Symmetry: C2
Subunit: 670 residues, 2 copies
């Protein structure tokens, strides 16, 4: 029915080898967990594991620790609400949410002994056979959440607040970003339908409107991000995040802010190492292009110019070439990226994750957009550049057949509907396939897996709970990065290639509405609950969105100019179109930034009001008079030209009288 008060579960597999090592690790883990102050219970594994459950034993000590963590947060400025002086109302005015309690328990479980409770991190090399420490899903909450979200047309801020309260700030931030993106997608959908109905394809007006929308949405989301950062009390959380276990520091100096001994790595060395990203980026771009362009040319040769038998069966060759070439190449480049950022010496784990995501973004962009770039810039405008490649493929096919009769071909004429077909696939077919892969096939494979396990001693009143815990353990930990990446790639599609298919935005909106519940279902029943982390922003995805919008401002105009014919594509015209579109994008960006700066942001205003209140709180915690001072000057020659100058009229009445006499003397001449 519900979790038996269990907060965290540790898998702790026990292999047949190193039994003594496993036993020593187990007893050390139990000792550490007892020292921190968490009650421990041990139960069945699957067949080699030893699942243990932890929970807070003394509620008062945990409440004190929660108050201490809140005080530390308010001291570092990540929250602007000052907690109560005594722990009697602060925990009651704002209750300890599930996410905060789980995060604090996780920090207690995994943190170095010098300042934490127990260093039970799985990547320390003294705690091996410990795959993960994960919390337990709430089945009733998941069911009610799914039902409520699927029975509502739109979600208010209360649902996102509930997501923040339960699953942490990172998942809540992703869902808020998805909701804002879906709501903002109704404008590009609306005027894309308008352009499709009224105008034709490759409309400059639609390109300008899409460029306007892509920057308006980005700036509005940045403002909403700033607002939500203080609404949930997470501001600059990266500053308070502790350093990674793997970190290379030459010396430890004094913190200029907190006045504490911290390990410092010179930023210039990190910048010098990061300068090597550009060769890596060029390498992955070239590697992915040399494969995608080759596959696309093979596909063009197979479909456009060919007359041999079995064209339909043979047409799958470049389709399957990609599904076996791009995985290996992407994996090799990912290994190179992990080698590169490992020596980049990132202190916080969040910075390391952001750098890894930024490195992966190049491959994601390459795989998601190289085919469209090739179609829009190398195929449609110039059908003659591909002639050497087509001749090479013809020669390869002829020498592969090793037969006579000079197999026939056809004249090569470009297909104006190729970009429409590609956009339609990426907008509808790829989306349906992705939805199936995201939702139905993982659940089906999990059902099959467990079924087989069951087809190939516990205690009463807990057998069902233990078995559901065992099934939950096998599920992979939910990664919010993948959903962010999918949404960012979709936004890139909108910003860059939607001018060739204005209907794409409507199907993007439909898919976003479906995904707002599909990702919820995936988190609920297809993945174990992630450890609740706190982030003040979506991270490097902001820069990804900015780059995608800027690139779309150019790509849309380039497509419009280069594909309107579907006179002979003068280069100055294309350059002028690109320049005008880019300048319009920059001017619109400046105007939107200025307008949003003029608009008040309640988050910053509330933070400033809290600062004002905490500054002002310390204040409560801490003619008859001029002559008196004038007379003391004389009592101090006696300064003939200094003291005597100001004592000539040491009174109001004498000053007034001398001024009157002065005025009449001055104007008694003329």
């Amino acid at each position: 029915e519900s979790n038996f008060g269990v907060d965290f579960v540790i898998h702790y597999k026990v292999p047949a080898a190193e039994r003594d090592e496993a036993e020593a690790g187990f007893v050390q883990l139990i000792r550490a967990l007892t020292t921190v102050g968490l009650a421990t219970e041990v139960r069945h594994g699957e067949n080699e594991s030893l699942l243990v459950f932890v929970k807070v034993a003394s509620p008062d000590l945990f409440a004190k620790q929660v108050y201490r963590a809140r005080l530390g947060d308010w001291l570092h400025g990540v929250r602007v609400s000052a907690p109560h002086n005594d722990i009697a109302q602060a925990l009651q005015d704002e209750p300890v949410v599930e996410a905060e309690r789980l995060r604090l328990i996780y920090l207690m479980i995994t943190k170095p002994h010098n300042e934490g409770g127990a260093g039970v991190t799985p990547t320390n090399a003294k705690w091996k056979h410990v795959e993960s420490i994960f919390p337990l899903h709430s089945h009733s909450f998941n069911k009610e959440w799914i039902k409520k979200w699927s029975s509502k047309y739109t979600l208010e801020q209360t649902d996102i607040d509930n997501i923040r309260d339960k699953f942490g700030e990172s998942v809540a931030f992703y869902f808020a970003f998805l909701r804002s993106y879906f709501r903002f997608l109704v404008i590009p959908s609306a005027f894309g339908f308008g352009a499709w109905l009224l105008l034709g394809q490759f409309s400059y007006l639609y390109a300008l409107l899409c460029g306007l929308w892509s920057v308006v949405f980005f700036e509005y989301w940045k403002k909403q991000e700033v607002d939500l950062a203080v609404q949930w009390g997470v501001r600059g959380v990266s500053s308070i995040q502790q350093s990674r276990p793997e970190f290379e520091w030459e010396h430890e100096a004094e913190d200029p802010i907190t006045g504490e001994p911290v390990k410092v790595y010179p930023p210039m060395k990190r910048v010098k190492t990061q300068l090597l990203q550009i060769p890596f980026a060029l390498a992955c771009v070239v590697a992915l292009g040399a494969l995608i362009v080759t596959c696309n040319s093979l596909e063009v040769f197979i479909n456009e110019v060919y007359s041999g038998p079995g064209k339909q069966y043979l047409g799958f060759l470049p389709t399957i070439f990609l599904v076996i070439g791009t995985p290996t190449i992407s994996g090799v480049l990912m290994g190179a990226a992990e080698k590169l950022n490992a020596m980049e010496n990132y202190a916080t784990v969040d910075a390391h994750d952001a750098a890894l995501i930024q490195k992966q973004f190049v491959l994601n962009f390459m795989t998601s957009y190289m085919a469209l770039f090739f179609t829009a810039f190398v195929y449609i405008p110039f059908g003659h550049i591909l002639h050497p490649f087509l001749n090479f493929w013809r020669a390869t096919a002829q020498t592969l057949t090793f037969s006579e009769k000079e197999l026939p071909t056809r004249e090569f004429q470009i297909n104006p509907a190729r970009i429409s077909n590609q956009m339609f696939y990426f907008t509808v077919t790829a989306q349906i396939v992705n939805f199936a892969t995201e939702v139905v096939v993982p659940y089906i494979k999990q059902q099959a897996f467990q079924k087989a396990k069951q087809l190939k001693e516990d205690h009463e009143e807990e057998a069902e709970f233990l078995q559901r815990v065992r099934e939950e353990c096998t599920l992979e930990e939910y990664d919010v990065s993948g959903d962010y990446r999918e949404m960012v790639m979709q936004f890139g599609y909108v910003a860059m290639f939607s001018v060739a298919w204005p209907l794409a935005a409507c199907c993007f909106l439909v898919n976003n509405w479906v995904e707002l519940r599909s990702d919820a279902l995936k988190i609920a029943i297809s993945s174990r609950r992630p450890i609740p982390w706190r982030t003040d922003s979506i991270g490097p995805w902001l820069t990804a969105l900015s780059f995608l919008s800027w690139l779309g401002s150019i790509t849309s105009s380039a497509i419009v100019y280069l594909c309107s014919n579907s006179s002979p594509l003068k280069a100055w015209g294309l350059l002028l179109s690109i320049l005008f579109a880019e300048h319009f994008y920059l001017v619109v960006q400046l105007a939107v930034r200025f307008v949003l700066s003029k608009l008040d942001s309640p988050g910053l205003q509330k933070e400033r009001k809290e600062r004002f209140q905490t500054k002002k709180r310390l204040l409560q915690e801490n003619s008859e008079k001029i002559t008196r001072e004038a007379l003391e000057e004389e009592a101090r020659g006696h300064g003939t030209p200094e003291e005597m100058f100001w004592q000539r009229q040491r009174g109001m009445q004498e000053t007034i009288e001398i001024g009157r006499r002065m005025i009449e003397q001055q104007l008694a001449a003329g």
Copy 2:
């Protein structure tokens, strides 16, 4: 020898008309000044004026007011150093500088009676005949300052700190900006000399280097500005500045930050009104262009194509056409700008001044660069476009002569050295003329004026002081906006048109070194001391510099492409050059911003440390245990599947024993 303790002087002319009104105003002014608590003395005027001198009577009350002002500043966050609780060490650890004392006395003299001392502002319509309230210059300080600055090759931060301490934060900020600009000008001078010596004219490499330097200097100056804002304790001073006397507010609401009743104007209305600036900008651009282009075409007709007698005498016609056409047009457009920003409803006086400066910047840019733009983009690349204008001028000259014989002309050939001559003038001749106009002719005219006055009853020991005060009163108040504008125009010259004359940067550096003392001399002996104001930045000049650098990134490349011939200037080549230069500028801007973000800023770090200290100060002002909590659960069926689950092993020893038995049971099968 020195001022007789006088802090501020009020002119208070007394005209022959409205003698009763003048007397009533004088007595009311004396009453108000007494109520605030300032001793007053009255002396000679010039012939119709009544000079009065004010000073603080009771030092203790003024010290208390200084402490209160410091507390208010620290409460609003413009300063991050918390003053001492008692006024005994705070005024001694940091002494009351002259600028701060003068500013506080001025605020006491001119401020509404509801919260201030006396509303003696000269623009209230009840205080007329009051031209200005000004402090007195220190002759010894001025002499020592001029000597020290002219006897040093470079100025350290101590000199700028002294300028801040005496003349206020605005003058100090201008001098710091000038010093930083002069120091940074040694790089463009160096590689401009390199390009001139090694390369030729119109070098793309020099254009790229200038684009790099213009953004590097801008970002470094922004960082230095942020540092100096907290070094002098002036951060967000615009937020604490009181509203202008002329302000239109529909309603008064509650301040979301300070919780005080304030007059609020909706920002959307101000944005809508500001949207009318673009028509104004286009209007002034067209008005100035239609005159400068006409004058330049007339000059070209006179010098290039002409053979009549008296060419040298007649060549001054377009030179004097500008000195009588651009003043009137600029004055009309300035009147239009003042009409526009008056209804823009700016609350703070600093915002109103910034808007006025931004409006004037369009005219300044037009006048300073239209001739160069015409020469570089309409004359050198295309000598055939000007043929209709030249024919029109020929017809005008022919019909003006009204004579026969068909006055002779010559074939029109463009002069490649025209841009070199124009740049040489703007870099050397215009600079020497500007230096003369700034320095020598105002002093000469002042000497003549006073001499004539003397050639066309006072008391002993003060006659010299009174006469020097009278001479100081006649001098115009120093305006720091003009020097800022001159420096910004010079930077625009460097960023935009220095690729046509790489030697311009060296003479710019020489002029900057000279100006660093020329402006000091102008402030010392050619202008009365301005009221010390506080600003956290140079203001709209930051946006002016950013726009000038961005425009130069394009203009330099356009000049390089369009003037290298001095094949037939293909448009795609020019567009490609502009696009590459702009993209290089944007990429370099991003890289410099990232690098400077990585670099630590001591000002922000110190502000954050102060915030940390003031947050932490409130902290000091405000196995045997797990079993005890576990046993209380039983004392609370009795929860068969919840309470009994965690009580199975309520101890370390039993947990260890059951875990051992569990491991052996699990691995006793295989």
